[PDB]
Design an enzyme around this catalytic site. Structure first.
Site, PDB file in Angstrom:
ATOM      1  N   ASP C  53     -65.226  24.928-117.732  1.00 47.29           N
ATOM      2  CA  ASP C  53     -65.774  24.178-116.610  1.00 47.29           C
ATOM      3  C   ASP C  53     -65.272  22.742-116.657  1.00 47.29           C
ATOM      4  OD1 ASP C  53     -67.686  26.295-117.723  1.00 47.29           O
ATOM      5  OD2 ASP C  53     -68.449  26.059-115.676  1.00 47.29           O
ATOM      6  N   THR C  86     -66.293  17.569-108.705  1.00 47.86           N
ATOM      7  CA  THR C  86     -65.744  16.697-109.746  1.00 47.86           C
ATOM      8  C   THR C  86     -64.239  16.630-110.081  1.00 47.86           C
ATOM      9  OG1 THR C  86     -67.890  17.088-110.807  1.00 47.86           O
ATOM     10  CG2 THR C  86     -66.236  15.893-112.075  1.00 47.86           C
ATOM     11  N   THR C  87     -63.560  17.728-110.421  1.00 45.21           N
ATOM     12  CA  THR C  87     -62.169  17.636-110.849  1.00 45.21           C
ATOM     13  C   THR C  87     -61.204  17.664-109.674  1.00 45.21           C
ATOM     14  OG1 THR C  87     -62.162  20.025-111.230  1.00 45.21           O
ATOM     15  CG2 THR C  87     -62.657  18.589-113.094  1.00 45.21           C
ATOM     16  N   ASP C 390     -74.816  35.352-109.971  1.00 45.86           N
ATOM     17  CA  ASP C 390     -73.630  34.612-109.545  1.00 45.86           C
ATOM     18  C   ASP C 390     -73.385  34.774-108.051  1.00 45.86           C
ATOM     19  OD1 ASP C 390     -73.357  33.829-112.137  1.00 45.86           O
ATOM     20  OD2 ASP C 390     -71.470  34.881-112.520  1.00 45.86           O
TER      21      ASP C 390
HETATM   22  N1  LIG Z   1     -64.048  31.421-102.986  1.00 49.78           N
HETATM   23  C1  LIG Z   1     -62.933  30.697-103.244  1.00 49.78           C
HETATM   24  N2  LIG Z   1     -61.708  31.146-102.889  1.00 49.78           N
HETATM   25  C2  LIG Z   1     -60.592  30.436-103.137  1.00 49.78           C
HETATM   26  N3  LIG Z   1     -60.592  29.241-103.752  1.00 49.78           N
HETATM   27  C3  LIG Z   1     -61.750  28.671-104.161  1.00 49.78           C
HETATM   28  C4  LIG Z   1     -63.015  29.384-103.926  1.00 49.78           C
HETATM   29  N4  LIG Z   1     -63.996  28.611-104.425  1.00 49.78           N
HETATM   30  C5  LIG Z   1     -63.411  27.497-104.935  1.00 49.78           C
HETATM   31  N5  LIG Z   1     -62.075  27.535-104.779  1.00 49.78           N
HETATM   32  C6  LIG Z   1     -61.125  26.485-105.222  1.00 49.78           C
HETATM   33  O1  LIG Z   1     -61.391  26.147-106.583  1.00 49.78           O
HETATM   34  C7  LIG Z   1     -61.428  24.733-106.763  1.00 49.78           C
HETATM   35  C8  LIG Z   1     -62.629  24.366-107.625  1.00 49.78           C
HETATM   36  O2  LIG Z   1     -62.230  24.274-108.993  1.00 49.78           O
HETATM   37  P1  LIG Z   1     -63.307  24.213-110.192  1.00 49.78           P
HETATM   38  O3  LIG Z   1     -64.572  24.893-109.728  1.00 49.78           O
HETATM   39  O4  LIG Z   1     -62.614  24.743-111.424  1.00 49.78           O
HETATM   40  O5  LIG Z   1     -63.592  22.643-110.451  1.00 49.78           O
HETATM   41  P2  LIG Z   1     -64.304  21.676-109.377  1.00 49.78           P
HETATM   42  O6  LIG Z   1     -65.575  22.326-108.883  1.00 49.78           O
HETATM   43  O7  LIG Z   1     -63.261  21.222-108.385  1.00 49.78           O
HETATM   44  O8  LIG Z   1     -64.717  20.392-110.255  1.00 49.78           O
HETATM   45  P3  LIG Z   1     -66.003  19.552-109.784  1.00 49.78           P
HETATM   46  O9  LIG Z   1     -67.224  20.307-110.259  1.00 49.78           O
HETATM   47  O10 LIG Z   1     -65.864  18.023-110.154  1.00 49.78           O
HETATM   48  O11 LIG Z   1     -65.826  19.324-108.273  1.00 49.78           O
HETATM   49  C9  LIG Z   1     -61.509  24.102-105.384  1.00 49.78           C
HETATM   50  O12 LIG Z   1     -60.462  23.138-105.231  1.00 49.78           O
HETATM   51  C10 LIG Z   1     -61.321  25.227-104.391  1.00 49.78           C
HETATM   52  O13 LIG Z   1     -60.162  24.983-103.593  1.00 49.78           O
END
Ligand SMILES: Nc1ncnc2c1ncn2[C@@H]1O[C@H](COP(=O)(O)OP(=O)(O)OP(=O)(O)O)[C@@H](O)[C@H]1O
Ligand SMILES: Nc1ncnc2c1ncn2[C@@H]1O[C@H](COP(=O)(O)OP(=O)(O)OP(=O)(O)O)[C@@H](O)[C@H]1O
Ligand SMILES: Nc1ncnc2c1ncn2[C@@H]1O[C@H](COP(=O)(O)OP(=O)(O)OP(=O)(O)O)[C@@H](O)[C@H]1O
Lengths: 519, 512, 529
Positions: C53, C86-87, C390
């Site tokens: 995460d 966040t990221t 989930d």
């Molecule tokens: N259902 C989905 N289908 C395709 N891509 C997705 C889906 N859900 C999220 N994503 C992609 O995954 C990325 C999220 O990455 P991750 O969850 O690893 O970290 P994050 O949530 O961006 O970090 P933070 O918690 O600071 O925002 C997003 O940029 C998004 O484009």
């Protein structure tokens, strides 16, 4: 102890291409600032110690001679540019390296070079069809004569120069010089000579061949200049009494032959002068200097003589008179003699000058410059050579496009819009091909000393509104319509520069391994 | 400082391959010894793979993760820890599909987790049911660990110790059949006697000695009492300390110490007990009022050991000594005894039933013999636990490895896609277990392993295993080299769970 | 010069600040997305924690550098604002600095870059808000059922996707309650997912009510009751004590006997006040006395003993009752009539295999339900419970925030074409600031394509090829709202797949990343002491 190379220089892979891309930019850096009419010149000295001052891109690359393999691939493209169109070596050298610069980060990320080959063949083939659509044929538009239009393009090319005040006089002379030629136009036919002294208004245009005439020997008060149909002789023989090549030294101890020894040395000069009298040559032109004794010979025989002629002006006289250059004197006959209608010795600039007018093969001209310095006339000669070049290409090719980066910013806009509708690996490469074509309006702002970012940000905003012929201006520090300001270039040279820059960029990308034989 | 990219994907491979190359030759009954060099010049020649990696310090984060995943696997089952680290190092050893093909690890993990489902499905097809009611079939399972030991002279009696211990802890009423040897089967060591004297009693033993003869020696109806509070001086809610340096403070403290303890001891002797058990310690003056009623003093017992006493007799856990009642009785217990065994006193609250708890009593001629049996019986108790967890065996000695690797080859012919290339690499990585068995025997490895695969193709896959004694191939139905299913199920599961953890690491960064 | 440190200025502090900031982006480059890779967090003690995460990565990442210390605080501004995102702020802002660092070498002052970034950020919110979707289509029209089916595909529950997606769609719409002026949100508490052995996974039933995992004990007491009163209490009806550590003194032996007879007599007095209220549903944590259960089988009160404390907090919140800790009201003993009682409709003891459950129906204000995950063994039931949890949080976090946006690379690919055409409309030394802002937004599908094991030059370009056609002509043959399916490696429509993201996680990400890229770009001199 058993090696496979044993001195063999060979390497392949990705960094062999990155070493070939960055080696292409050192040749473009040698001709980066020479782009444009206000570009900086380079100083090249040979092994003898003579310094050459020129800003032409064809003369720089011919004296560079870089032993790198990828640098030799930009030499023969500049050689083929002289055969295909005639000029444009500094345009295809700068454009070839900027294609490799934009794709240089894309090779390092793992993209194959053959996909970049397939994108350069695609976008250049679209650039050929895009040029011919925007290119308009201007032949009898708005019912204006073509002589008035040819003085307008030379006025902008000669602007911001030394003769920018009197550019109305110099624009009318460069049009009539090309109009005096035949349908076979050539820049080598119209010669430019310089006469020191006087103001800029005393510049004259000779319809025939005129040379410097540095013959400063004797021969005044005789040898009349006006001749109706003289026989033009082109010689390379010395006519001095005590010459460095024509002499006679016999060592006898008799006083009777001592009169005959000096008479035999005079008979070398006298028989070489008697053969010109039998051939009927009214004017005597020789490369070697002519002595004072031979000037007294043609003075009583009603003929003219003038030595110390350069061999470049003798070959232009051969193409005008239609004869042939004969070195010896026994072969001087009517097969090598010339003819003209008006020959006279003028006193323009204080010195004596000879010129023929009314030749049967009068396909050559001579431009006489007047000014207070030779380096004033040296830059005027290159500017008037540039003024002839814009006039000459307008007569040959009627379908022209707007210069000054207007055709480069329009091609950068269409190829960017085509890349947004194409999925796959052709989007990031053709989109980088459109941004690499913006180096021509960018280096035109760098060599002119303008703000390169303040003009180019307003130039792309003008093309986004619908401006198709807006480019940079060399006089004003703003953008202007180059089609309205008569800044033109033909469509055929712009097409042939694009297919040569794409072929030079494809030959570097397709090379991945260098083979060297130890010898 | 920091490291990212494809270098940590190759750096974690060589970190796990170095651990696997150390104990690769320690597999089977012909396991080679390993020599450890101490800074003080000491040398231990133990060939046990858990003992080698424990005394070796590691500095790599991937190599440190390799030891702890087998150490937790040693706490679950008592056999198969060497085969985990060997298989985890062989699955990552074929780096041609990881680096040369420029493949992302997500393709490999999707191929590795899909191969994990074929591990459980193949082992249930080559399995065999076990007649657990017959004691002769249980002797042929535990005998693989009793060989070349000092306990092997009494194999007929030592097998009765571990078999009776696992059946009392296992509860058939709960359905899931839980066995926990650490709590309900707490093993204690008693010096003196012989190996034949060691037996199993149905109760809990207290190792506290007898310091005074005014105690209960033989009670037929033991009245037990459990208490949580302490038996000492009354402390306040603050953190003050007790220091007796003055004669005026010595009289006032001891008068308050006697009056509170006599008030506490009057509540427990009104029920006429036989043995007192307190959670905290018992002071010296607290035994002075306790010896007048002839009660056995038992102190310093944990809370985890307290519930085993409550489930043995049926008493009530009372929090405070002022709150005793008549329901705190131990009616139903067998006998209370403080009889000495080899000049050590032990309290017996044993019964003639199964009160969900037990203990193991060991005896021997010297204390080194006491440590020899407890390390052999605890290794034997976890193996026989997996048999009673699921009565299913697998053909061991490399026979199950070649049967699994044969099923993956025919399955890979119908598995299309890019992931079929790392799917075939797991089949060749599972052949390292019969590969090191031939190399430890001394025969030609490739000459025997090629004929081993030819026997697994045409003939039955449940037979034609490897014997790690003579160096040739025998049938596994003829010799008792049978392994439990739950050991081999968790072995391939952990080797995949290690390979899914090390290949997923793509960056190593610092920070506190 | 004699100062108290070392001084360094110029463009060399600009190049050192972007190389220290983009190195932090490589720590959170591969961990982006649902298929993100794990990374080792080495501690100073020697142990290592395996986390994937990205929010926990930046919390434990300790880089002693002031350029990297700027990106540490934006994680605290992200969770306190919305809680997610966040990221995605880190990879955007670091690629914003890397493209702006190329502008410094191209003879552009950063003042035009800072003023160009704020106009590119405000126009990014304008193009997003003109292409939103209101929170609707809860019933009848699917982008939901299919929305939760994608989250359920990674487990063993995904064999029968249409059977289990209906259990989570109707459960999300059941827990909806406005409670403030027409907000409606969804609570952090959700349906209680129990399990049983119903011989297959296809015997799951959607029970519209809470299910308690307790057994009533005796059988002579009737299991079907009609009355509405529900009693909840925490004090034990068993023999009570003063304290676990403090006890009362008992000296005389006959004094011990009469407090036992008083304990049998005071249990007769407390049951007279409980049954006088008419409450049949009796749930006691501390247990029920043996003679007290004799009075309940003749009166007909449904008494359940040994109930969990956390289960009773959801029961008292269901019927609106108050949890009574002690029955003594500080001078005597009372039952607090008409205060700790709720209302209901029907409580049936349903016959469920291996755990006979207690279901409650039509309470005061609960809005919760229960899903009985009947299966074959404990392996398939434990993995299906975390799959339901989930899939619950995916539909929950979308249908809260009042409007949503099709995300997953659909936002940044559409912004890369509009902001480039907007950059050619302004000029004035800020065209290159907005044109590099559009190329810096392309790193979100670029890192998602390399994590999906696909060709990143093809998958990102397929997103921009479809989003460009929405701006050229408004014809319906142009594909609109094209998302990125990382599983199959092919772009699809987010409206059909149901991949949605909130607007406040997309707006505040572009707002915080440009303000973080502004602060690092304003650094032109370094002073140390
Ligand atoms: N259902 C989905 N289908 C395709 N891509 C997705 C889906 N859900 C999220 N994503 C992609 O995954 C990325 C999220 O990455 P991750 O969850 O690893 O970290 P994050 O949530 O961006 O970090 P933070 O918690 O600071 O925002 C997003 O940029 C998004 O484009
Ligand atoms: N009078 C002018 N005003 C504005 N731009 C001009 C003018 N003349 C030429 N240019 C621009 O300068 C560029 C070429 O510059 P330059 O004359 O230095 O090279 P060149 O000699 O034309 O090259 P080549 O010999 O290869 O054709 C052309 O792209 C043209 O658009
Ligand atoms: N004579 C034999 N020939 C070949 N293989 C044998 C022979 N005897 C036993 N084996 C097999 O060797 C295996 C033991 O291998 P290894 O030593 O690698 O594991 P281990 O150290 O016993 O595992 P653990 O550390 O969990 O006790 C046994 O499971 C058994 O099936």
């Amino acid at each position: 102890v058993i090696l496979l190379k044993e001195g063999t220089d060979s390497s392949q892979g990705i960094p062999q291409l990155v070493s070939n891309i960055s080696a292409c930019q050192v040749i473009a850096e040698a001709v980066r600032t020479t782009l444009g009419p206000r570009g900086m010149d380079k100083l090249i000295v040979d092994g003898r110690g003579k310094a050459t001052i020129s800003n032409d891109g064809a003369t720089i690359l011919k004296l560079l001679d870089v032993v790198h393999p990828a640098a030799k691939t930009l030499v023969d493209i500049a050689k083929s540019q002289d055969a295909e169109v005639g000029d444009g070596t500094t345009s295809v050298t700068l454009l070839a390296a900027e294609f490799l610069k934009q794709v240089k980060p894309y090779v390092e990320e793992g993209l194959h070079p053959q996909i970049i080959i397939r994108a350069f063949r695609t976008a250049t083939q679209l650039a050929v069809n895009k040029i011919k659509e925007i290119a308009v044929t201007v032949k009898k538009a708005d019912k204006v004569e073509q002589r008035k239009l040819l003085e307008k393009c030379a006025m902008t090319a000669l602007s911001s120069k030394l003769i920018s005040q009197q550019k109305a006089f110099f624009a009318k002379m460069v049009v009539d010089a090309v109009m005096m030629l035949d349908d076979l136009l050539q820049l080598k036919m119209i010669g430019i000579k310089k006469v020191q002294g006087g103001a800029l208004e005393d510049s004259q245009l000779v319809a025939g061949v005129a040379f410097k005439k540095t013959f400063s020997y004797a021969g005044f008060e005789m040898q009349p200049k006006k001749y109706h149909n003289p026989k033009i002789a082109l010689l390379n023989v010395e006519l001095e009494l005590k010459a460095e090549k024509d002499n006679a030294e016999i060592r006898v101890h008799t006083v009777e032959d001592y009169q005959a020894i000096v008479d035999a040395e005079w008979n070398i000069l006298y028989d070489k002068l008697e053969k010109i009298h039998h051939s009927g040559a009214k004017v005597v032109s020789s490369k070697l200097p002519i002595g004072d004794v031979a000037t007294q010979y043609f003075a009583d025989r009603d003929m003219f003589c003038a030595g110390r002629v350069p061999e470049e002006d003798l070959k232009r006289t051969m193409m005008a008179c239609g004869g042939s250059i004969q070195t010896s004197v026994n072969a001087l006959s009517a097969d090598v003699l010339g003819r003209c209608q008006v020959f006279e010795e003028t006193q323009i600039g204080g010195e004596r000058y000879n010129f023929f007018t009314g030749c049967p093969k009068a396909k050559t001209c001579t431009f006489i410059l007047r000014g207070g310095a030779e380096q004033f006339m040296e830059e005027t000669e290159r500017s008037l050579h540039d003024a002839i070049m814009i006039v000459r290409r307008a007569i040959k090719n009627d379908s022209v496009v707007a210069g000054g980066g207007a055709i480069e910013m329009e091609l950068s806009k269409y190829l960017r819009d085509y890349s947004r509708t194409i999925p796959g690996k052709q989007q990031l490469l053709i989109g980088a091909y459109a941004k690499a074509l913006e180096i021509i309006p960018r280096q035109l702002c760098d060599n002119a000393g303008f703000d390169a970012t303040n003009i180019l940000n307003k130039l792309r905003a003008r093309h986004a509104q619908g401006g198709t012929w807006y480019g940079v201006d060399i006089n004003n520090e703003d953008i202007a319509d180059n089609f309205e300001a008569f800044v033109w270039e033909p469509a055929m040279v712009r097409i042939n520069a694009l297919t040569a820059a794409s072929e030079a960029a494809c030959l570097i990308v397709s090379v991945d391994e260098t083979i060297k034989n130890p010898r | 400082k920091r490291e990212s990219g494809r270098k940590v994907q190759s750096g974690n491979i060589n970190a796990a391959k170095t651990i696997a190359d150390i104990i690769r030759t320690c597999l089977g009954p012909k396991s080679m010894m390993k020599m450890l060099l101490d800074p003080m010049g000491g040398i231990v020649m133990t060939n046990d793979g858990n003992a080698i990696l424990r005394e070796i310090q590691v500095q790599h984060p991937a190599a440190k993760s390799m030891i702890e995943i087998s150490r937790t696997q040693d706490e679950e089952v008592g056999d198969g820890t060497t085969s985990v680290i060997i298989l985890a190092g062989e699955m990552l050893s074929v780096a041609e599909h990881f680096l040369e093909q420029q493949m992302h690890p997500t393709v490999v993990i999707s191929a590795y987790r899909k191969a994990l489902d074929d591990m459980i499905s193949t082992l249930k097809k080559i399995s065999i049911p076990v007649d657990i009611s017959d004691s002769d079939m249980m002797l042929n399972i535990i005998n693989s660990s009793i060989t070349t030991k000092a306990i092997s002279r009494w194999s007929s009696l030592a097998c009765n110790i571990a078999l009776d211990a696992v059946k009392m802890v296992q509860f058939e009423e709960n359905g899931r059949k839980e066995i926990d040897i650490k709590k309900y089967a707490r093993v204690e060591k008693i010096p003196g006697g012989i190996i034949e004297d060691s037996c199993v009693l149905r109760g809990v033993m207290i190792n506290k000695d007898v310091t005074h003869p005014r105690m209960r020696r033989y009670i037929k109806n033991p009245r037990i009492v459990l208490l949580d509070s302490s038996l000492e001086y009354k402390k306040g809610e603050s953190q003050t300390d007790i220091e007796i340096t003055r004669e005026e403070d010595f009289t006032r403290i001891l008068q308050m110490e006697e009056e509170y303890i006599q008030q506490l001891c009057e509540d427990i002797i009104q029920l006429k007990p036989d043995v007192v058990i307190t959670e905290k310690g018992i002071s010296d003056l607290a035994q002075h009022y306790l010896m007048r009623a002839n009660i056995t003093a038992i102190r310093r017992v944990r809370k985890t050991d307290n519930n085993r006493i409550a489930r043995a007799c049926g008493a009530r856990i009372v929090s405070r000594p002022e709150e005793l009642r008549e329901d705190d009785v131990g009616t139903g217990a067998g006998l209370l005894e403080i009889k000495k065994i080899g000049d050590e006193y032990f309290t017996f609250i044993t019964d003639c039933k199964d009160p969900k708890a037990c203990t193991i009593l060991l005896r021997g001629a010297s204390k080194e013999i006491l440590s020899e049996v407890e390390r052999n019986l605890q290794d034997a108790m976890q193996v026989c636990r997996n048999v009673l967890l699921d009565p299913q065996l697998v053909p061991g000695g490399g026979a199950s490895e070649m049967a699994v690797a044969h099923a993956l080859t025919e399955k890979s012919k119908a598995m299309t896609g890019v992931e079929q290339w790392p799917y075939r690499a797991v089949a060749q990585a599972l052949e390292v277990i019969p590969r090191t068995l031939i190399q430890n025997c001394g025969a030609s490895t490739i000459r025997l392993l090629t004929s081993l695969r030819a026997k697994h193709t045409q003939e039955n896959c449940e037979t034609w295993g490897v014997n790690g004694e003579t160096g040739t191939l025998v049938d596994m139905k003829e010799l008792g080299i049978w392994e439990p299913l739950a050991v081999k199920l968790q072995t391939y599961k952990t080797a995949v769970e290690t390979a899914v953890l090390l290949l997923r690491i793509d960056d190593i960064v610092s920070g506190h | 010069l004699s100062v108290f440190g070392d001084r360094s200025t110029g463009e060399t502090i600009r190049s050192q600040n972007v190389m220290a900031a983009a190195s932090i982006a490589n720590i959170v480059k591969s961990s982006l997305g649902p298929v993100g890779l794990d990374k080792m967090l080495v501690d100073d003690i020697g142990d290592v924690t395996i986390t994937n995460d990205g929010a926990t990565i930046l919390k434990l990442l300790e880089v002693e550098h002031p350029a990297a210390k700027v990106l540490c605080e934006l994680a605290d501004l992200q969770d306190k604002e919305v809680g997610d995102g966040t990221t995605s702020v880190v990879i955007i802002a670091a690629e914003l600095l890397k493209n702006a660092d190329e502008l410094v070498k191209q003879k552009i002052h950063p003042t035009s870059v800072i003023s160009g970034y704020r106009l590119a950020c405000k126009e990014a919110v304008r193009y997003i808000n003109e292409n939103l979707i209101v929170n609707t289509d809860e019933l009848g029209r699917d982008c939901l059922i299919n929305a939760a089916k994608t989250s359920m595909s990674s487990k063993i529950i995904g064999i029968n996707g249409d059977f289990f997606a209906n259990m989570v769609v109707d459960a999300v719409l059941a827990i909806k309650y406005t409670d403030i002026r027409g907000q409606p949100r969804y609570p952090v508490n959700s349906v209680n997912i129990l399990k049983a052995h119903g011989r297959s996974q296809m015997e799951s039933m959607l029970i519209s009510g809470y299910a308690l995992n307790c057994v009533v004990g005796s059988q002579g007491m009737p299991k079907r009751i009609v009355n509405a009163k529900i009693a909840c209490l925490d004090f034990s009806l068993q023999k009570t004590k003063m304290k676990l550590g403090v006890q009362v003194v008992i000296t005389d032996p006959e004094k011990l006997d009469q407090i036992r007879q008083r304990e049998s007599d005071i249990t007769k007095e407390r049951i007279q006040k409980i049954l006088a209220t008419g409450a049949n549903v009796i749930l006691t944590t501390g247990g029920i006395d043996d003679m007290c259960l004799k009075y309940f089988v003749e009166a007909g009160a449904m008494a359940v003993r040994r109930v969990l404390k956390r289960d009773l907090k959801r029961i008292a919140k269901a019927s609106g009752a108050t949890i009574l800790s002690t029955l003594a009201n500080l001078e005597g003993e009372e039952t607090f009539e008409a205060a700790m009682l709720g209302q209901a409709e029907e409580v049936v003891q349903e016959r469920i295999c291996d755990d006979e459950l207690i279901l409650i129906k039509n309470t005061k204000a609960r809005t919760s339900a229960s899903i009985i995950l009947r299966g074959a063994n404990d392996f398939m039931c434990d993995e299906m419970e975390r799959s339901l949890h989930d899939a619950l949080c995916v539909v929950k976090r979308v249908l809260e925030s009042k409007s949503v946006v099709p995300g997953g690379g659909a936002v940044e690919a559409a912004l890369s074409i509009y902001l480039e055409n907007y950059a050619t409309s302004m000029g004035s030394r800020e065209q290159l600031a907005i044109a590099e802002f559009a190329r810096s937004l392309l790193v979100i599908p670029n890192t998602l394509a390399v994590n999906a094991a696909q060709d990143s030059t093809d998958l990102v370009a397929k997103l921009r090829a479809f989003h460009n056609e929405a701006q050229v002509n408004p014809e319906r043959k142009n594909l609109k709202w094209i998302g990125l399916d990382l599983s199959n490696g092919k772009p699809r429509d987010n409206k059909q797949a149901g991949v949605f993201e909130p607007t406040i996680v997309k707006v505040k990400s572009l707002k915080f990343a440009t303000e973080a890229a502004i602060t690092i770009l304003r650094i032109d001199d370094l002073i140390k002491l």
